[PDB]
Symmetry: D2
Subunit: 458 residues, 4 copies
């Protein structure tokens, strides 16, 4: 009839002082919010206020410690996953593939950087997106991600449905459960992950190019074993969860109070470990920035080509008022043709504040174009070149190129042009599967890690 | 108040399909009565969801249960009698995880060997009933996977959407159990501090002070010897429930890769499951389903168990003689266990198979109070574990573990303990959706008492 | 019966040469009387030999002694009163190492904190004498570094070749101590098994059974919690002796590299040394020598110690306020310790320096038996440690350690203990070349008793 | 007067059954023995029978386990030190230097081999040597090593002096004490040792040649740390002690019985962990081979160019009668011009026995010549080439090139020609300090390790 099933829905409030501060923050204007009825939103938030959290505060405190090391130039941040997760594709094979692809990158980057890599997935919550246009090319209300409405090009599917708040949480908690299982039970074994990398080198069209570094890494691993390193710390990995904090109904409902066995109680957003604010919602006096101000999680802000040095400093002063290294990550996405010019005066001005942000490169979102064959796509070479320029900016300034933020999948999709597979405009039509932006496929994402490893090694 | 999910629009190896079909074609007791087409829709949803557990965890559990079977570890299994969707919250889950960990510390010290920790959690949403009409003249409550606790006819109708609600709640609970155990709740030193606070405040804490202090001095000894808090920071808590609703269990089957031997069916709704008294028909679907899955399994054994039938369970469910694959869960009643258990243990031991012998001291010791509550006396619960130990000591066999129903809540559900919970007291916080649980103090007191059994 | 060694045919920093010269120019008590030119030849040999210890070990010991001084570890120091060349054998060295380890296990459990293990070994070859003529009318025996034990005049002549014989024996003993401690003698589980055998066979083993079993259950708990035998397989035993013969100690000085701060003189005849009652003249060469070397040092404090003099030792020997650099070693007599120690501890604590307070319960409790033997009563030895603990408990200060004279041999040298060694018994195996030692059973019994003091 | 000092000398016997077997073995003829009086030898043996052992049996059992792994192709044996230790040069700086030089080699070989390296020093007992001629070029009785007589060209010094048995033990136990201290207290820290290697690359004349591999190793080490390997297993190293078992008075006096907490009591030679029998004393029916037969230690036999395949098999049958992998090491020293020809039929015949020996290359003792300027010397290139040929023999046969046995020192001596320093015949006169054969100096020994690492990597 509909080919759906309906699932029926049937504790103490947050402290009054923290709620008072939250309410003053959320009184600010919020861009890009769903347009569902307030009373229905309230009902769904009330459901979510009672569910088990996706993450817990001690994990977020640990992440914060590891991100402080990144900010101080003593680790590197890898952040990667789908552009937009869908409920339909939130499956074991797909989750496992994206976790594998992230781990494979991390091995190569760890060796290249000669320092720890903090692994943060875009996963278990990346279900909401902004739109510039409220009507899409089919004359429909725009798809806004599965937390808000449906991808299917159908008017009914596109109506904003607050029950998707609860479907999002179910999907997020189920995905996170599996990410925890996979990372603690042997998928994330260093030797197993490297074996996958060896197979990539064996079969890639440009594997000859990456053979030398792959063999080095292999000889590094075998050296560890030769020296009598026990495989204990090598058996499991930590993968943290992240998404864009966009739908404030969801994020506010997933706020919890820490139990104060750590230093004192505060608000954590336990929908994720770390979240970032996007280019379309980072209004300095808007609700998203004010929400980020109130929560204890590490946070990031996207910085595009219109960014000024002065506005960047404002973000730093609002979001890192206590000068905690790693609390704030500034995520540059300029375009490969602009990054070398636009980034330096922003970095200089922010460095002069005495604060220590993480400088992270997003080489995807500034390098998107439309193909002749009608697909939204990005060229691999432009993605690579923005990271190259980003490294050059930091090397010239003596600052730390702190990490990358990429959109990838373990699927063999045909979404970005180029790479060693030499994906063409024609090829795009084969497996163009993204519900939003074009992702690096599993080979392209690994090839990028090898290339960035060589940047790190210089 | 509906959320809504879409019904999704590589085949099993032929032999596994054949064997699964044959198992599920056998008669199955205690199944919900809902329409086949609606059940199919829900199963098709569940066949696509992320699993609650993964096969490598289950293989690890099997290794650790083999050590139990060989007399080199002890099995602690505990949690709610029935999880509810309403009470599937962070505080409640944290409390039950804490209560299990607290027990495990005391039992680990008492046993002088590792304790395998298995929660009744993230799936324990279905129960059998002897009668389909209850004392109020309603269709019986069968757990939140099947129908609703509320005493009205509409709530008690069997609703297949509860299959998917059960999974949602299970996966969210399991996520949190993983987080809590890897991120410091399960720190050995933190858990023991809770035990010290119990001794401080219990009415019979004087009784348990000496052993508590011994444990404390054992922990400090580790630190004194330069043991780093690496192995001590985190714990493994496995998930278990009664495999009852075969619509749910069959939909949560996944095929392993052939990285370990050959491809097998794992039930990834849990790490380990057990078959109950009312569904363990030797030629029934539940026992046959258990034969087809790779998980470690248990079978409840009540007072009508024969030595010969016990051997037949062993031979059907442990056909490859894999130590720890099968757990036999005695629940006899404290007045019967000493008499009924020995000839069952003797006969099974003579097979050359190595089962885990596990004591369930709850389900054989239930009575109704004057004040109308289903309850159990603490002293009878303790005494069945005592008798169980005596049976094994006399035979030279391994008293392998306990299976108890507990909660971290301060409920008033079982009589007695050091709090001396009375029939009157029961009315205060009788919160269980099914059987009476040991509250958090009673569960810890039981662990101290069983530690003293282990030490003798 | 001579082996023969050749006299070997970068200058100190000027300030260290100046300070060493000034120290050694001060008056030195209790020195051998042998010709300067012969002493010089021997020192020149010793200036070229491989050191018994190395500076990084001494820096590590200093770190571990700082933890003792801060109340976070306990110091066990024990071995022969006087090592002899004749008894410097594998069995004897192994026995004394075993006896020290056995004590350390019990004390570690009792203290609930790490025990720093320091043997009187690999150098303890020289002793002071109050009288230069002994009861037989001979020149007194002064230890094998100086002259011979045999009661005849020729053997008692001071012989500087014994300097080099002492080093040879020391370095050979230290080699073996290193081998034994890294290669399984010092395995925690093996050492505890020896303790279990003692409880099995001692006449008062019933008395110590409960604590022995507690310790056993503590060890098994570690294993149960999945502690790997990595940290448990090996132990560190440091070497110590009284720094008495300044010809020997000065020849065994080596200059550190400047990898840790600046170059310093280390005495590499040992890890730590102490200055005795008869050589601790505040303006004498021994105290000045101790000021110049980087090793942790101790000073013996007897019944005539004032609080003011104790403070002067602290200020001279710990001028930089480095916790654990100085150990003050109380030896008062069991009848005096409670009275004499408190005002010394109070005054020193008020300085803001953190010394190690260590009990030597032997040297203040020596008497002569009817049957002619120098002996000590076990009960008086125990009682001085008891009083020492009482002094510290009353003051809120740290009873930091003990310094005892023990052997792994079944000798008959100290009266009493559970064996009830009598005056008659003494004649059986009175084997010490100087003071009466606790035998292997008495030394272990003492550790059990001091563990109970630690537990109160 | 003499410029010496005299040191005066002042327990249950070994079991009667073991002594009976020992006496039957030592009844055999023994070559190259000192000629001191029997009654004086007996007195000195009686002294030594009572001294603390240099090594203990549990260490030797552990070595045997690690050598079994070498024999099975899963580890590599490095054995190195002075040709002849002297008492005069048995000092802290010299011992420390030789330990450092061995460790430096081991790091490079571990990385190159991608498997553990068993580190065995020629040290703490290498005090005795054979001679072909009983009169030397000065018309004196030949120097036979400090255990027997004195190096000084003086008739009195050259008389065989049994008190040197006890001086040898004193020196051995003092050296071993220090080797234990150094290896457990931070000299043997992996990172510290590698830093020395970095400094060598910085300053060697051919450091450009070895820079790439040095940097690889550095990046391997930093990878370990990046992956969160704790520096516990990396802080200390095991260095075992070895010498040629030549003077049977010494070796027999240092026999001890194991305490039988291991499987059963037997005779261990506790003067060392492992000993070998030389080319001049390996008579198949001689006392040295029979002594090696009776002791439990791992043992080696030198095989020179006159070796037959049949005699090699005889050694295997006498010395490894229980087919214990690693118990026997066969140490080829052929000459670089002969090894490729002479070794293969020996390896083939021995492999066919079903026994697993360690095949170890001694590239020194077959490659010695006299310079025009009068010095006994070896060319670096010939030393390297014999190891090269040795590897080629094993690669062709599918057998395991199991290790090397070299004569090295941490001193900057001028004893072997060539290397990157290009040591000439003229240069030899500068620091020719060996009491017997020419050693690789500290730079040459490290350069050899780099070159053999490249052999391992092929
Ligand atoms: N693909 C998902 C299926 C899903 C994930 N978590 C839950 C929880 C409860 C029911 C279904 C699911 C979906 O379409 O939501
Ligand atoms: N486990 C040690 C690691 C090590 C420590 N120092 C060194 C020096 C050279 C090689 C290795 C090591 C080992 O592999 O022996
Ligand atoms: N206690 C839960 C609340 C809830 C609603 N949807 C989900 C999804 C996943 C976990 C929990 C929940 C209930 O009433 O079902
Ligand atoms: N880390 C060691 C543990 C140990 C090993 N053997 C012994 C013997 C006695 C006491 C302790 C130990 C240590 O704590 O010294
Ligand atoms: N007990 C020793 C035996 C001995 C003789 N020379 C040495 C050298 C090193 C150690 C011991 C010995 C003694 O009588 O001196
Ligand atoms: N390896 C863990 C140690 C541990 C950590 N937390 C707890 C709580 C209760 C018992 C033990 C542990 C283990 O033994 O399970
Ligand atoms: N160079 C050494 C010095 C030596 C080494 N060990 C001992 C023991 C006793 C006396 C001297 C030495 C030598 O010439 O023997
Ligand atoms: N301690 C882990 C090591 C590790 C395990 N799996 C992976 C995968 C990719 C990189 C590293 C690791 C860590 O460094 O995160
Ligand atoms: Mn995107
Ligand atoms: Mn129940
Ligand atoms: Mn004394
Ligand atoms: Mn040589």
């Amino acid at each position: 009839m509909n080919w759906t099933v309906d699932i029926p829905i049937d504790l103490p409030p947050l402290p009054t002082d923290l709620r008072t501060r939250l309410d003053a923050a959320l009184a600010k204007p919020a861009a890009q919010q769903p347009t569902w009825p307030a009373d229905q939103a309230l009902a769904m938030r009330t459901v979510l206020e009672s569910v088990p959290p996706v993450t817990v505060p001690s994990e977020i405190v640990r992440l914060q410690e590891q991100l402080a090391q990144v900010a101080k130039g003593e680790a590197f941040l890898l952040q990667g996953g789908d552009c937009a997760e869908t409920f339909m594709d939130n499956t074991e094979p797909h989750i496992r593939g994206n976790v594998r692809a992230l781990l494979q990158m991390a091995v190569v980057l760890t060796y290249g950087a000669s320092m720890p890599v903090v692994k943060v997935a875009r996963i278990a919550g990346q279900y909401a997106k902004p739109r510039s246009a409220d009507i899409d090319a089919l004359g429909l209300r725009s798809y806004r991600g599965d937390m808000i409405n449906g991808f299917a090009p159908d008017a009914a599917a596109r109506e904003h449905d607050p029950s998707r708040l609860v479907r999002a949480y179910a999907n997020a908690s189920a995905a996170m459960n599996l990410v925890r299982a996979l990372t603690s039970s042997g998928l994330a074994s260093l030797h197993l992950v490297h074996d996958w990398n060896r197979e990539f080198v064996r079969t890639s069209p440009a594997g000859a190019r990456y053979e030398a570094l792959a063999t080095e890494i292999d000889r590094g691993l075998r050296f560890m074993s030769a020296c009598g390193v026990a495989d204990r710390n090598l058996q499991t990995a930590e993968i943290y969860a992240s998404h864009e904090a966009l739908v404030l109904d969801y994020e506010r409902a997933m706020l919890r109070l820490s139990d104060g066995d750590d230093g004192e109680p505060q608000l954590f957003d336990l929908s994720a470990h770390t979240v970032w604010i996007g280019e379309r919602t980072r209004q300095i006096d808007g609700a998203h920035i004010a929400f980020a101000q109130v929560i204890a999680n590490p946070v990031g802000v996207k910085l595009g080509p219109n960014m000024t040095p002065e506005l960047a400093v404002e973000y730093v002063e609002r979001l890192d008022p206590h000068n905690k290294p790693g609390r704030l990550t500034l995520v540059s996405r300029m375009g490969n043709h602009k990054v070398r010019d636009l980034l330096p005066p922003i970095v200089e001005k922010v460095q002069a504040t005495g604060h220590q942000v993480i400088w992270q490169c997003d080489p995807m979102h500034g390098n998107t174009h439309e193909s002749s064959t009608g697909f939204k796509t990005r060229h691999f070479d432009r993605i690579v070149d923005e990271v190259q320029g980003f490294f050059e900016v930091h090397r010239a300034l003596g600052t730390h190129p702190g990490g990358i933020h990429v959109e990838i999948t373990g699927e063999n999709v045909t979404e970005c042009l180029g790479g060693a597979q030499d994906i063409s405009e024609t090829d795009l039509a084969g497996r163009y599967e993204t519900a939003c932006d074009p992702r690096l496929n599993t080979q392209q994402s690994l090839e990028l890690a090898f290339l960035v490893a060589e940047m790190l090694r210089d």
